[PDB]
Every structure is written in structure tokens, then in C-alpha cells.
Ligand binder design. Sequence first.
Ligand code: HEM
Length: 455
Amino acid sequence: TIKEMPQPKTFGELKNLPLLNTDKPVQALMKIADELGEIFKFEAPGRVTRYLSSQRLIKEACDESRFDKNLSQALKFVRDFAGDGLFTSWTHEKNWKKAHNILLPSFSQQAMKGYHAMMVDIAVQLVQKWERLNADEHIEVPEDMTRLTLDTIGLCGFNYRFNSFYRDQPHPFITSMVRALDEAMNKLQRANPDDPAYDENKRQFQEDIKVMNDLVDKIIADRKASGEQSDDLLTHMLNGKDPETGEPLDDENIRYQIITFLIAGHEATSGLLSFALYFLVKNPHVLQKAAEEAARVLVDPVPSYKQVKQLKYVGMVLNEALRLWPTAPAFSLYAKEDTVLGGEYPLEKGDELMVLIPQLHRDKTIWGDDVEEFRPERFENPSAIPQHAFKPFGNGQRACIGQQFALHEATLVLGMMLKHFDFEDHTNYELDIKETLTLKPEGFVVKAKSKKIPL
Ligand code: HEM
């Protein structure tokens, strides 16, 4: 029963483009998704995209023999500074498989034991910052969670300390980075390269890239000159060789990997932590369950790797937050060959499909009718969840390599926050989701009363 594909209103040669001409594109798309259903054709002047929203179709899109990772327009733009790092390479580019094969064992759950001490370091700095606040001062959740993630990836990545908790103005690198990312997203909604985009922006963009390249390159050069063997990712990349080709990574790719770990990892992981706290503070009974587990398990001044794995309920909290608002809301796919989706919608070779994750997670057919409710218990038995119903980390060989890293950190940090402080939503915050490459709660502020437990 092949059905015709819907489409929202168009604007001449500008097509549906104006439809997403807003500061909250993904959220608008979810709205359109509600109206048009599990699949719609979004057309732009010289680009076509089909957005999927149902587990029915998406489980078919996740068939790797039929569809493969497509570099969306945004990724192409991000490639200007992330080059051929894992995130912005095609599956068929030689450096994708090389870096993938080498980095894989370094991102396993087992490998987290080696990064744990470095994760604890930045975690304790966050707790102490909060411990030292004068009672009357509040906390800027997204802002602190961001400082937490940048520093953790910097330390675990290339053993470099950005020291974000010692300054107002971030390290110039981070500034150039957020700015480059910002610009990258701006080109996406550019009317044309001279509206607004002018030589001034392009100049700035090229300067930011220099700042990032200079720092990373130097660090890479120094490491191989000194010959230092730390437990960071840079060490693994300098001493690794692809089992297949027998080749090591080039210094430039290595640099791109490091930049990739930062741009791809920080915003999403900080967003995750913000939403989880948001939901916890809005659902007292859940917070009470989590705080008790945390106090019950984290019996030492500093969390051990083993202990973090015993925080079962906190894990459920993170997953449920990931269900409701996946911080990386979408990923693109293209058809390797002509085919039909759900035996209804015909697809041609190279057609792009954009998976709308937030909509996938709201599929009443899989999640029941209480999809908008925050209930961690629904992940009590993950094995009861259908395949391809929960995809916050992408699909297949192209899924987030930093998944275990993200979850281990988020679980460590949340556990420590719930153990040392009681949180107060003193302003009865109303959720405003800011969108960049990721999703994050804009302006979320809270107040934390310490339980005076030592670190
Ligand atoms: C909780 C936070 C995170 C979320 C929600 C998330 C989500 C995702 C998603 C959806 C993808 C696939 C994108 C696509 O198919 O186009 C992805 C890819 C990737 N992520 Fe994450 N991510 C998170 C944290 C991290 C962290 C901390 C790192 C860095 C260490 C990271 C590194 C990567 C890389 C390098 C890839 C590409 C892997 C490959 O294609 O070989 N992510 N992530």
C-alpha cells in the first residue's frame, strides 16, 4: 500500500526553507512531525530530505546493508575544522576505518577505569565550587556542566588543563571553538554567502581554525618530542596501528580526532546532565529515589570505578532524560541502492533520510501513552525495550564511539551532586530549549544547599 509523501507549505524557489528559519529548528520539525505523521518530505532550493519519526520505518533505516551514514549539510560545514575526524568522515574514507579500528578498544567500558581518576579530578572541582558558594548565590546549570565536560575531555583527550573553574572568560581555544561551531550553524541558515555572511565572518572563521590547529599541533609535536606516556587518548593515537592496514594515524588526522572529541562530545554531554537535573528537580519522588541510592552507594569521599557502576537507578534517570530530550536530536542516512521503505515509500539511490530522534522516543506504539512523562522505571528492564526504539547514540558502526565515556561521566557526576547537595528550584524554572548542534535548557538556574559531607 504505497502512500504519497506529504510536505509542509512552500515559499516558491525558496521552498520549505523559511519553515525552519527560526532559532529552534528541530523543535519546529517535531511540530510538523505531529501534523504530517511518521514521514514527510522537506524540500529546500537544491536539496531534498525525508524526516522519519516512527520506529516502524526507522528500524528499516537502521539496516546497514541498505542505508549508510550521510554527511548532512551541517556536518559538511563542520568538516571545515573537524576535517576527516570520526564524526565528519564517510564510512568509505580510509581514515574513517583506520581511526575507528584503532580507537575502538580505547572507548570500551573497560577502558573507562583508566580515565576514571581524571574524570574524578574535574568532578571534585565542580563539587567544591558549589560547596564554596555563599548562601544567597545560585547555580547556572548549563554553564557549569559545560565547564565540567570541556575540561574532562581536555584532560582525558590531550592531557591539557583549560582550567575553566578558575576563570570567567574561557580559554581562547574554547572561545574559537564555540565561535567556529556557531559560524558553522549560521551558514546552515544563511540566505546566501553575502547575506548575512561576509568576508568579515569568513575571516574570523579562518582565524578561529588557526587558534585550534596551533594549540593541538604544538601539543602533538611536544608529546612525541618528549616521548611522554600518559593515560590520555593522544597517547593511544600516537602508539597505535590499524590492525588492517598496519598503518598508524597521521599527525593531522590525530589533530582532527582531538578537535572531534571536543566539538562532538562536550555540548551533548553537558546538555544530558542539565536535563537530568531539570527532570529530577521537577520530580521530587524520583530525586528522592536517586539521592538515596547515591548516599547508599557512594560511601567513600571519592567515587571508585566499581561504585559508579552500581548506581543503577541514576542510570535509569539518565536514559529517561535521553529518551525525552536526546541532546544530539538527529542523524542523516542515505540509500545505498534504490529501495522501498515500509513497502510503501519508494527511495532512489542516494536519497537522504533524516532521523528525528525526539519523535522516535515519543512513539506511543512502543512507549505507551505516557510518553511525555518522566519515569525512569520504564528502563528497569532494558531488555524489554524493542530494537531500534531508543537511539540517542546513533546507529551501527556509526554510533557514538564516546557512549561509555559520556554515560560513565554523567553517572559519576550526577551521583556526586545527589550525594552532597539538596537542590532547590527557587525560581520555578520554565523549560526553554536552546538549539545549536545540540539541545540544552537555556537559563536553567537552581540553588544547592550542602549536606556538609566531606570530599
Ligand atoms: C551524552 C552525550 C552524547 C550524545 C547524546 C551523543 C550522540 C551521538 C550521535 C547521535 C552520534 C551519531 C551522529 C551521526 O550519525 O551523524 C554520535 C557520534 C559520535 N560521537 Fe557522540 N554523543 C555523546 C557524547 C560523545 C562523547 C563524550 C564523545 C567524545 C569522546 C563523542 C564522540 C563521538 C564521535 C567521535 C562520533 C562518531 C563515531 C564514528 O562515526 O566513528 N560523543 N554521538
